[PDB]
Symmetry: C2
Subunit: 327 residues, 2 copies
């Protein structure tokens, strides 16, 4: 079938080094789906040279699905006719930088890329923001592309979801693939709320299987919440490969469908569960025919409401902080 | 079906960081083949801690095929009942080191691992050496495991093969997947000899398509031969992801079969083409039912013989240099 154009930012960086080869291998859109990679990196000579090196390696893998690949230094050319965009590049938190500095630096990046997508990308492009802060960066991009459907701007909560999935499998001693109805609410940050209240393994309640709410509060939540730091502590560097895997999972499920299984996606709120409309938030969803649908009717107990409030508050503080660049 | 135990060395290193996730994803042995990873790193605290971090990331990917995973600091436990072994870890060429120093350091590593495989691995384990010098390291391991079939010790020439494949596709403007009968002779080094004399695209001679022997000699050969250096020059670091891809290709084709297609494998010479028996050398082969078979009857012209002689000479110099550690 006809190749899909996939645009990827921060292409010479770490996450992309684990990401690009798997996309070219057919992991993201299917084994029968040819892809054209439109790679973007900052204009700097060193970065462009490094991108040239990554491209050489991809060619050296002899991937049959790779129908084309081009390098860019301008988002306007990189996003041209793109069917899917993975916004990985972002400004990391450097020395001396306060929260307001990080928010502004990223807002300047995402308003530009959002405008570029609005101008040249496919009219129904699917966008996934991976670069931190993911939810807020996705919101900025979305707000910056008024001619495009807001529902098409998503943020990656799939890494938090997969990490929660692995802690549950470990605790219950059950295969990670047998867990159903687990999902995460909120921000892709330590304030995320992995909700195991509806999760089931072979039809049995996970919550009842564990039968220990203290584990949930003092062990499960904090471990998943601080997992990225644990990896940096052990490896010395960030969790590139698992973040890349989660991005592939996100697009794969969005495009190919979950067949009834629930998953987590950071999406623009339509007001469900009392989340203000427009806020990019992690919600439990099912997907089909390239569209997602929020799972309705879940009960929100006192504990859940307080957790949801904390993560929503963090997202609102971030939004307030970039509002001025969205004039 | 029953899970296969895959042992991998230098597991906290770069090549492995691109390799492990793809093995766990089912890329190497099939999508219906569960795997158990037995990972080895040197005993040092920093290395073992980093290995713990990589393992955390793999868990965080929630791979359904991963039936188990253990970390080791001793080859004797790492190779236990291993069905396949990927010897990635090796001693890199550091400052002050002469060729004899590099050869000895690696010989000390591979005699130990070869003995360990001989003692505890599956009686029919398949071994692939990726760590440099690959051909010689494979030879040392093979010589160190007398109770195991010598034909089961192989070296990775698949990266040189894939790189040659990409240069031909680029030159002819034809899809990399349409090229048949291309292969590489010799050492996994710049003395390798990519042979395009039998290569065909849709039934047409590649050699005749290009119709320029000077390109072959002064452009094709040197480019493929120095490709790794070109990548280091561009990226600042080695070609980890494409080397990992070639390793997967090597095992995948060996185990699942090439269905008549020719590929390159560094194997112990049985004397074919006048290559001394026992020398691990790149030969064109076809594979089926987990076994390889050297393609016979190829013509070796004057140019080919001189190239074969150069690469064979390099391999013999290396062998002479480690012979004393094989007492």
């Amino acid at each position: 079938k006809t190749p899909m154009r996939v645009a990827v930012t921060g292409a010479a960086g770490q996450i992309c080094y684990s990401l690009l080869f798997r996309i070219a291998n057919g992991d993201m859109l299917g084994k029968d789906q040819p892809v054209i990679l439109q790679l973007l990196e900052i204009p700097n000579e060193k970065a462009q040279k490094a991108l040239q090196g990554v491209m050489m390696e991809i060619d050296d893998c002899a991937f049959p699905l790779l129908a084309g690949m081009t390098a860019h230094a301008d988002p306007m050319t990189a996003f041209k006719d793109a069917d899917v965009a993975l916004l990985v590049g972002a400004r990391p938190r450097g020395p001396g930088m306060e929260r307001k500095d990080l928010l502004e630096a990223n807002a300047q990046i995402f308003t530009v890329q959002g405008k570029a997508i609005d101008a040249v990308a496919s009219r129904n492009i699917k966008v996934l923001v991976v670069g931190n802060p993911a939810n807020t960066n996705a919101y900025i991009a979305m707000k910056s592309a008024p001619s495009l459907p807001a529902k098409n701007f998503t943020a990656m909560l799939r890494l938090d979801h997969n990490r929660a999935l692995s802690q549950i499998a470990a605790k219950t001693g059950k295969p990670v693939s047998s867990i159903e109805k687990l999902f995460v609410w909120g921000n892709h940050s330590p304030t995320m709320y992995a909700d195991y209240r509806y999760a089931q393994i072979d039809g049995a309640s996970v919550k009842d299987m564990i039968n220990d709410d203290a584990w949930n509060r003092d062990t499960f939540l904090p471990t998943v919440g601080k997992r990225g730091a644990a990896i940096i502590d052990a490896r010395g560097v960030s969790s590139a490969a698992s973040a890349a895997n989660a991005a592939i999972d996100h697009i794969h499920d969005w495009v190919l469908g979950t067949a009834g299984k629930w998953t987590t996606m950071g999406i623009p709120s339509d007001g469900s569960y009392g989340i203000p409309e427009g806020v990019i938030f992690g919600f439990p969803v099912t997907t089909e025919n390239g569209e997602y649908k929020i799972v309705q009717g879940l009960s929100i107990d006192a504990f859940s409401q307080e957790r949801i409030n904390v993560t929503l508050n963090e997202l609102l503080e971030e939004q307030n902080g970039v509002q001025h660049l969205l004039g």
